[PDB]
């Protein structure tokens, strides 16, 4: 309970939209009205799961 005073100052996470993945562990994701971003994946997420 008293951890959240030093936990909520961490900035929030964006939400986006996958179009399609490609070679060498990256995906093409677009944001709300913001441009498409070629971003990488984390280690706990499978590409075929995306």
């Amino acid at each position: 309970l008293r951890e959240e005073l030093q936990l909520l100052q961490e900035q929030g996470s964006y939400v986006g939209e996958v179009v399609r993945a490609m070679d060498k562990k990256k995906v093409l994701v677009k944001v709300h009205p913001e441009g498409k971003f070629v971003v990488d994946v984390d280690k706990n997420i499978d590409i075929n799961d995306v």
């Binding site: 179009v19 990256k26 441009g35 971003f37």
Partner: protein, 384 residues
């Protein structure tokens, strides 16, 4: 990759043994030369050391922008995805050849410099117009014409499959082919036989969907059609029912008849403009040949003009042999009574009867088609 294009002796000669053993020395000496790079200058691994250096150069956020110009000293004005455009620089691992104005690129996140280009995801209209697979059965499915089946091969198939006969003549093939006749005689049927046979890319568009609801969206649609047709291959452009551009007036089209006109002027350009045309064959089809513009049917735009007649009464019997081939037809029936039923029944009517008589048998779960099936079939199909 494309190391040597000579294959010409095609035997067990010493010349084929000499050439490839020469190339054997051009490869090993090239191998042993480049092997001694890492032997005396290790300095990296080069499988990843140049790669990770690039991958650490380019940022993990990668924003997507747009080209609009190039200044060739590796910096160009690029447009960001909001609309505020910059004057960033271009790198050296960028392969500065695949850059056109309008190509989607990858930018840096920090200084927005052009890192890499992006392969485009195209298109939601190319796949609309491009025929995916071969439609149906062969030329043997047609029957009865036999005079213009030769004609279409003469202008489409034979220029493509035998490019020696026009050369020994010293001639170029006839350009345009139009197909006309009464409705239901096999105009659309013959074009499927071409798309069965050919190895070209085959594009189809109907004449009714050439007209648009906005001004000038019509002639834009034609210009990008022939752009698609030219940029692929030797290709075949099939435009069906082109009298429908001028007969039916629709209230969606804000421009009236003088927007139909400006579209046909663009179509009149794309067949015989002054531009370098390339290897594009044009097939057209209609059933009201007297309505459309005679400037579009002049030689130079359409050379061959093929008429389709009504089926003759001994070609009619051939058509019944086709559409009743793979059905378990009972021996009650006599096809020759069916032939002269309508004096001018088209080839479409024959399939319209043969498909309907099968539907009456499934009402009674039967497997063979009897005579009274056909007796009530032409009452259902023709007479209404």
């Amino acid at each position: 990759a494309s190391k040597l294009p000579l294959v010409t002796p095609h035997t067990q000669c010493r010349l084929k043994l000499l050439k490839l053993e020469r190339i054997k020395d051009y490869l090993l000496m090239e191998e042993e030369f480049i092997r001694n790079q890492e032997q005396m200058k290790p300095l990296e691994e080069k499988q990843e050391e140049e790669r990770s250096k690039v991958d650490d150069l380019r940022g993990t956020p990668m924003s997507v922008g747009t080209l609009e110009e190039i200044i060739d000293d590796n910096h160009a004005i690029v447009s960001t995805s909001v609309g505020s455009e910059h004057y960033v620089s271009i790198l050296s691992f960028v392969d500065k050849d695949l850059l056109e104005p309008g190509c989607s690129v990858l930018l840096n996140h920090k200084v927005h410099a052009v890192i890499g280009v992006l392969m485009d995801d195209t298109d939601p209209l190319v796949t609309v117009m491009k025929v995916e697979k071969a439609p149906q059965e062969t030329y043997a499915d047609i029957g009865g014409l036999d005079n213009q089946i030769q004609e279409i091969k003469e202008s489409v198939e034979l220029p493509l499959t035998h490019p020696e006969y026009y050369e020994e003549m010293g001639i170029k093939p006839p350009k345009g082919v139009i197909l006309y006749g009464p409705p239901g005689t096999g105009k659309t049927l013959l074009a499927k036989a071409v798309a069965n046979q050919t190895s070209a890319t085959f594009l189809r568009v109907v004449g009714s969907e050439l007209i648009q609801k906005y001004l000038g969206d019509g002639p834009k649609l034609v210009r990008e059609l022939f752009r698609v047709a030219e940029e692929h291959a030797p290709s075949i452009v099939f435009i069906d029912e082109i009298d429908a551009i001028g007969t039916k007036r629709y209230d969606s089209n804000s421009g009236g008849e003088r927007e139909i006109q400006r579209t046909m002027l663009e179509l009149l350009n794309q067949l015989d403009g002054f531009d370098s045309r390339g290897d594009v064959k044009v097939i057209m089809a209609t059933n009201r040949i007297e309505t459309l513009d005679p400037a579009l049917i002049r030689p130079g735009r359409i050379d061959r003009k093929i008429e389709f007649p009504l089926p003759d009464e001994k070609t009619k019997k051939r058509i019944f042999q086709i559409h009743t081939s793979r059905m378990t037809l009972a021996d009650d029936v006599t096809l020759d009574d069916l032939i002269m039923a309508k004096d001018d029944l088209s080839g479409a009517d024959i399939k319209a009867i043969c498909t309907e008589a099968g539907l009456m048998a499934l009402r009674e779960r039967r497997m063979k088609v009897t005579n009274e099936d056909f007796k009530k079939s032409k009452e259902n199909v023709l007479y209404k």
